[PDB]
């Protein structure tokens, strides 16, 4: 990891964490948390999950109730992060949030429309396979140039590893970015607690971690996916917690938004 490891204070460390936890119920006055993103026909999961968590953390920590951080800005302008719509690194996305900063969804709206990721779309989105999107151009003015550019920054970035870090960080500071390996059997998930049993490896996938809990003696993470609200359980999925399922507990990325 390029980011420094998160160290917990003596007070944070000794906190008795609850058997279940939900970020939306923990910060009920933060409207960005329960919102689900759509990355569209682009490999921008690394950027979209980051911008979602940064938006959440401006409410949990930054003192701003409802600001949406522009995934598009991060996607296009962080060339050191990866190759835009062809994949990137969550760690470097958070490093960019502090060293340079990001505009809001209002300044630079996400350039790609809704599309269907699994199969059938009840709202009538075209298939995402129908679209082939290149990495958008990095812009330095708001799409509507008459809207002033407001730049949003964090003041620190750190990495996280393992069940306890994830839980402890989530509890104190809210949603952050994690990553895991996708297999064929994940694509059609719609219920239950996910566990890889069959299917070919497809690729890495960055996502936003919002909660934990236990269902019928099976501990799990509650995760916000970025395949719009029609995928999984209303945009979310549950995954096995405790034994790094698909490497979900191998690396997490987070930081603290600065009050502007």
Ligand X SMILES: *[C@@H]1O[C@H](CO)[C@@H](O[C@@H]2O[C@H](CO)[C@@H](O)[C@H](O)[C@H]2NC(C)=O)[C@H](O)[C@H]1NC(C)=O
Question: Which residues in this chain contact ligand X in the complex, by CB under 6 A?
Answer: 72-73, 76, 108, 111, 136-137, 139
128 catalytic residue (yes or no): no
The answer to whether 89 touches 178, Cβ cutoff 8 Å, is no
Rank residues 7 and 137 by Cβ distance to ligand X and give the closer one.
137
The residue within the footprint of Na ion, chosen from 38, 91, 165, 230 (CB under 5 A), is 165
68 is catalytic: no
Residues 6+ apart with CB under 8 A from 86: 43, 135
**Least distance between ligand X and beta carbon 139 (Å):** 4
Which is closer to ligand X, CB of 23 or CB of 108? 108
| 76 interface partner picked from ligand X, Na ion, none, CB below 5 to 8 A per type | ligand X
> Residue 15 corresponds to which tokens in the numbers above?
């906190």
Q: How many CA atoms lie within 13 A of 160 on its CB side?
A: 27
Q: Which residue is closest to Na ion by CB? A: 162
- Residue 230 binding result from Na ion, ligand X, none, given CB thresholds of 5 to 8 Å by partner type: none
Query: Catalytic site residue 114?
Result: no
Euclidean distance between CA atoms 183 and 73, whole angstroms: 29
11 marked as part of a ligand binding site: yes
Q: How far is the CB of 5 from Na ion (least distance, A)?
A: 10
Q: Residue 252's binding partner, choosing from ligand X, Na ion, none, with beta-carbon cut-off 5 to 8 A by kind?
A: none
Point out the catalytic residue in the list 68, 107, 225, 228: 225
Among Na ion, ligand X, none, residue 165 binds (CB under 5-8 Å by kind): Na ion
Binding-site annotation: residue ranges for Mg(2+): 11
Q: Name the residues annotated as catalytic.
A: 45, 205, 225
Binding-site annotation: residue ranges: 11
């Amino acid at each position: 990891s390029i980011l420094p490891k998160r160290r917990f204070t003596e007070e944070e460390a000794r906190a008795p964490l609850p058997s279940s936890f939900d970020s939306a119920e923990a910060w009920p006055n933060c409207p960005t948390i329960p919102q689900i993103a759509d990355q569209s026909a682009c490999g921008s999961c690394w950027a979209v999950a980051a911008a979602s968590a940064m938006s959440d953390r401006f409410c949990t920590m930054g003192g701003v109730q409802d600001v949406h951080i522009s995934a598009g800005d991060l996607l296009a302008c962080c060339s050191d992060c990866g190759d835009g719509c062809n994949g990137g690194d969550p760690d470097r996305a958070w490093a960019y949030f502090s060293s340079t900063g990001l505009v809001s969804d209002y300044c630079q709206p996400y350039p790609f429309p809704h599309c269907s990721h699994h199969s059938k779309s009840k709202n009538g989105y075209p298939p995402c396979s129908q679209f082939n999107f290149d990495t958008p151009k990095c812009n330095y003015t708001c799409d509507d140039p008459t809207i002033p550019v407001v730049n949003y920054r964090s003041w620190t970035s750190y990495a996280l590893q393992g069940e306890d870090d994830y839980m402890r960080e989530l509890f104190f500071r809210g949603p952050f970015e994690v990553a895991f390996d996708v297999y064929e059997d994940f694509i059609a998930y719609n219920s239950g607690v996910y566990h890889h049993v069959s299917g070919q490896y497809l690729g890495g996938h960055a996502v936003r971690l919002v909660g934990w809990g236990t269902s019928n003696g099976v501990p799990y993470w509650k995760i916000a996916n970025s395949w719009n609200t029609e995928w999984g359980m209303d945009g979310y999925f549950l995954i096995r917690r405790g034994s790094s399922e698909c490497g979900i507990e191998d690396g997490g990325s987070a930081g603290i938004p600065l009050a502007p």
